[PDB]
Structure 1
Amino acid sequence: GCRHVAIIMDGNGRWAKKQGKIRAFGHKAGAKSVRRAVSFAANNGIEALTLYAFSVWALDSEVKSLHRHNVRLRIIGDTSRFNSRLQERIRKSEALTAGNTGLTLNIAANYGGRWDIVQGVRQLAEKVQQGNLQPDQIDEEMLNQHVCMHELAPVDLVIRTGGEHRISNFLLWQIAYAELYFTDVLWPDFDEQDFEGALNAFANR
């Protein structure tokens, strides 16, 4: 069974252009597709769902709602430049939902897979400097403990919408053994049948 799905949500801009409408309009139907995919994952017993915007201030309004649905919210990515009022909103949102036991929802914000690895490297380098760790002691498992989502089920399936066939520096370390699923369907149109189409692909491998 599929435990942890990651989705690259591409196609909002193309979609808007197809409908002879501006970017703004695509983002908003995109947000609608986010809620449906979240709901579909929670109702189908997926443990973790990780979303990458490829094509945050709008998460204030959705948090109370996620909490009641027993959803644990996390933001992965570099939030250190972000102004400190938003940093503390993200912190409160995380804190509010952290004891929740349903779907863990990871939102990648200013995330890059290379950045993710490097930040973990930096941490082991600090340890080496301090005298706490020898070079030859560093192995896969220890680096794993310092990259994003090490406490979750490993990523089983990566879905990319919108037609491109690339990871584009989303998760790198984490997807060594994931099924990759590429669809031409643009993010605002990706619905429950597309999502199940992708879980199918994973079951057939």
Structure 2
Amino acid sequence: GCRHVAIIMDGNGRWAKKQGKIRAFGHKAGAKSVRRAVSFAANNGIEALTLYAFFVWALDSEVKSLHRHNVRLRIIGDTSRFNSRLQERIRKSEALTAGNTGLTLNIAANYGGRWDIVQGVRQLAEKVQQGNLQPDQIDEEMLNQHVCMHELAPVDLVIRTGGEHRISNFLLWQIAYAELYFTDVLWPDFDEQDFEGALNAFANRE
């Protein structure tokens, strides 16, 4: 009954080094593993897939395919300091797919869980400053409404590949009740079997 999976994709670098290859080769294999995880999620009725790299062209090449697959693409994180061209391509890719009803694919870029919260806080603070909001009126529901992804199903499952047992300032507010699944498998090795293994762990919690 897994609706929203988030994944910390760790291990690209150690994978390259184990293969006796340069760091870039690990990334090439990482992108493959992303494609395969995105397909797996859409094929298995998962509503949202949120990915954290722990892109310049990765966007422009892959977007039309995602669109045709009825995938809704979103970038979460601080894109404000990205160059204005890349910001505009992100913007276009988002608007192109915004009406799609299949898998929502969130890519975290220059994202942090504390930053995420702070952005919502600044918004509420702005409302307070202009008299439209009393301090004592602020509650979890309200703050929940201006942290990223508040319009999607709650994060059910966090997967972290690569062996570390940490959130590392990924989603924080959102993972309050999420199943947390850690595997030593390196991200480029992470396949459909590993993904399903994580999904069952969620299943066997309940």
Moved more, 53-62 or 99-108: 53-62
- Pairwise CA distance, 1:59: 1.3
Aligned length: 205
Post-superposition, which runs of at least 4 consecutive aligned residues in structure 1 deviate over 2 A?
none
Cα-Cα RMSD = 1.1
In 1, Cα distance between the equivalents of 2:55 and 2:167?
13
Identity %: 100
- Pairwise CA distance, 1:55: 14
- Pairwise CA distance, 1:60: 0.9
- Pairwise CA distance, 1:56: 4.0
CA contact (8 A) 1:9 1:55 kept: no
- Pairwise CA distance, 1:2: 0.1
**Cα distance per residue 1:59-98 (max 9 Å; x no partner):** 1100000000000000000000001011110000000000
- Pairwise CA distance, 1:57: 3.2
SS at match of 1:61: helix
- Pairwise CA distance, 1:35: 0.2
Could you list the runs of 5+ residues in structure 2 that have no partner in the other structure?
A: none
Residues 56 and 178 of structure 1: CA distance in aligned 2, closer, same or farther (over 3 Å): farther
**Cα distance per residue 1:90-127 (max 9 Å; x no partner):** 00000000000000000000000000000000000000
TM-score (norm 2): 0.98
CA contact (8 A) 1:75 1:107 kept: yes
Could you list the runs of 5+ residues in structure 1 that have no partner in the other structure?
A: none
Moved more, 158-167 or 52-61: 52-61
In 1, Cα distance between the equivalents of 2:117 and 2:57?
26
CA contact (8 A) 1:10 1:55 kept: no
In 1, Cα distance between the equivalents of 2:83 and 2:154?
31
TM-score (norm 1): 0.99
- The answer for the alignment partner of 1:53 in structure 2 is 53
**Cα distance per residue 1:23-43 (max 9 Å; x no partner):** 100000000000000000000
In 1, Cα distance between the equivalents of 2:94 and 2:29?
25
